[PDB]
Scaffold this active site. Sequence first.
Site, PDB file in Angstrom:
ATOM      1  N   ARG A  34       1.986   6.590  -0.673  1.00 31.57           N
ATOM      2  CA  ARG A  34       1.047   5.486  -0.858  1.00 31.57           C
ATOM      3  C   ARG A  34       0.176   5.392   0.382  1.00 31.57           C
ATOM      4  O   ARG A  34       0.666   5.148   1.477  1.00 31.57           O
ATOM      5  CB  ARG A  34       1.797   4.173  -1.134  1.00 31.57           C
ATOM      6  N   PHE A  60      -6.025   0.231   5.748  1.00 32.22           N
ATOM      7  CA  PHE A  60      -4.801  -0.563   5.690  1.00 32.22           C
ATOM      8  C   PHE A  60      -3.661   0.240   6.338  1.00 32.22           C
ATOM      9  O   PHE A  60      -3.322   0.001   7.497  1.00 32.22           O
ATOM     10  CB  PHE A  60      -4.497  -1.004   4.238  1.00 32.22           C
ATOM     11  N   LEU A 118       1.141  -9.296   8.135  1.00 30.94           N
ATOM     12  CA  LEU A 118       2.491  -8.780   7.970  1.00 30.94           C
ATOM     13  C   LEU A 118       3.457  -9.203   9.071  1.00 30.94           C
ATOM     14  O   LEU A 118       4.653  -8.954   8.951  1.00 30.94           O
ATOM     15  CB  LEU A 118       2.449  -7.250   7.863  1.00 30.94           C
ATOM     16  N   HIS A 136       7.498  -7.784   8.102  1.00 28.09           N
ATOM     17  CA  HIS A 136       7.891  -6.381   8.286  1.00 28.09           C
ATOM     18  C   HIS A 136       8.256  -6.168   9.736  1.00 28.09           C
ATOM     19  O   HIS A 136       7.574  -6.672  10.616  1.00 28.09           O
ATOM     20  CB  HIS A 136       6.743  -5.454   7.890  1.00 28.09           C
TER      21      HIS A 136
HETATM   22  C1  LIG Z   1       3.790  -6.627  -1.776  1.00 27.58           C
HETATM   23  S1  LIG Z   1       4.395  -5.052  -2.340  1.00 27.58           S
HETATM   24  C2  LIG Z   1       6.024  -4.969  -1.505  1.00 27.58           C
HETATM   25  C3  LIG Z   1       5.848  -4.568  -0.040  1.00 27.58           C
HETATM   26  C4  LIG Z   1       5.717  -3.048  -0.013  1.00 27.58           C
HETATM   27  N1  LIG Z   1       6.904  -2.402  -0.667  1.00 27.58           N
HETATM   28  C5  LIG Z   1       6.895  -1.128  -1.151  1.00 27.58           C
HETATM   29  O1  LIG Z   1       5.884  -0.446  -1.021  1.00 27.58           O
HETATM   30  N2  LIG Z   1       7.993  -0.549  -1.736  1.00 27.58           N
HETATM   31  C6  LIG Z   1       9.253  -1.199  -2.071  1.00 27.58           C
HETATM   32  C7  LIG Z   1      10.359  -0.824  -1.268  1.00 27.58           C
HETATM   33  C8  LIG Z   1      11.620  -0.603  -1.860  1.00 27.58           C
HETATM   34  C9  LIG Z   1      12.736  -0.281  -1.082  1.00 27.58           C
HETATM   35  C10 LIG Z   1      12.620  -0.184   0.307  1.00 27.58           C
HETATM   36  N3  LIG Z   1      13.667   0.112   1.070  1.00 27.58           N
HETATM   37  C11 LIG Z   1      11.380  -0.411   0.893  1.00 27.58           C
HETATM   38  C12 LIG Z   1      10.262  -0.739   0.124  1.00 27.58           C
HETATM   39  C13 LIG Z   1       5.611  -2.591   1.456  1.00 27.58           C
HETATM   40  O2  LIG Z   1       6.631  -2.517   2.109  1.00 27.58           O
HETATM   41  N4  LIG Z   1       4.403  -2.307   1.994  1.00 27.58           N
HETATM   42  C14 LIG Z   1       4.263  -1.783   3.421  1.00 27.58           C
HETATM   43  C15 LIG Z   1       2.799  -1.821   3.684  1.00 27.58           C
HETATM   44  C16 LIG Z   1       2.288  -1.410   2.367  1.00 27.58           C
HETATM   45  C17 LIG Z   1       3.050  -2.294   1.376  1.00 27.58           C
HETATM   46  C18 LIG Z   1       2.396  -3.553   1.225  1.00 27.58           C
HETATM   47  C19 LIG Z   1       2.754  -4.673   1.999  1.00 27.58           C
HETATM   48  C20 LIG Z   1       2.092  -5.888   1.846  1.00 27.58           C
HETATM   49  C21 LIG Z   1       1.058  -6.001   0.921  1.00 27.58           C
HETATM   50  C22 LIG Z   1       0.687  -4.902   0.150  1.00 27.58           C
HETATM   51  C23 LIG Z   1       1.349  -3.675   0.295  1.00 27.58           C
HETATM   52  S2  LIG Z   1       0.869  -2.210  -0.698  1.00 27.58           S
HETATM   53  C24 LIG Z   1      -0.289  -2.815  -1.917  1.00 27.58           C
END
Ligand SMILES: CSCC[C@H](NC(=O)NCc1ccc(N)cc1)C(=O)N1CCC[C@@H]1c1ccccc1SC
Length: 164
Positions: A54, A59, A121, A125
């Site tokens: 991704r 970003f 974030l 995070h």
């Molecule tokens: C609001 S979407 C949930 C947050 C997202 N999570 C995932 O991409 N995958 C789920 C996941 C499942 C298991 C583990 N261990 C880690 C992540 C995440 O960690 N991120 C890191 C930066 C990119 C993405 C994200 C965060 C906040 C807002 C949007 C986004 S991507 C549209």
Amino acid sequence: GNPLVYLDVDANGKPLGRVVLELKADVVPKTAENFRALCTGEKGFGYKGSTFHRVIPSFMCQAGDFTNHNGTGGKSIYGSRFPDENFTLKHVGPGVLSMANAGPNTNGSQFFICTIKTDWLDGKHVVFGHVIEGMDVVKKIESFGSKSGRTSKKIVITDCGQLS
Ligand SMILES: CSCC[C@H](NC(=O)NCc1ccc(N)cc1)C(=O)N1CCC[C@@H]1c1ccccc1SC
């Protein structure tokens, strides 16, 4: 001192170069150690061969799902998931290394490298390192992303390990 680790990255089989990361073991030792060991592969599993699945321009670039290759998987060296260690370090700008998650206390192996300041974030995070060398490589990876996160090339971590 703090560990230095590297990721060597290819795009459609062509080498892009090396990203070198400092892990802030002084501040987040548990989170740093997880990433370090996944880079060396010393527990029998890790990042080598996995993808940046991704990538969203202006970003971040996200990777580390070495079980499912789609953002649903990964595991830590401690178990399937581990808690948020602390939120002391902030998403200050490009080159910050931070843990992806599925809500509070769901860290596994997925991570992202920021290409902008992502201050929204902070407190959600866990930040645990930064790019030392290879921001040019990160910008190449970023250029193959899209608004949806889908990549226009297959971006693979072909090798990784510890430098010091
Ligand atoms: C609001 S979407 C949930 C947050 C997202 N999570 C995932 O991409 N995958 C789920 C996941 C499942 C298991 C583990 N261990 C880690 C992540 C995440 O960690 N991120 C890191 C930066 C990119 C993405 C994200 C965060 C906040 C807002 C949007 C986004 S991507 C549209």
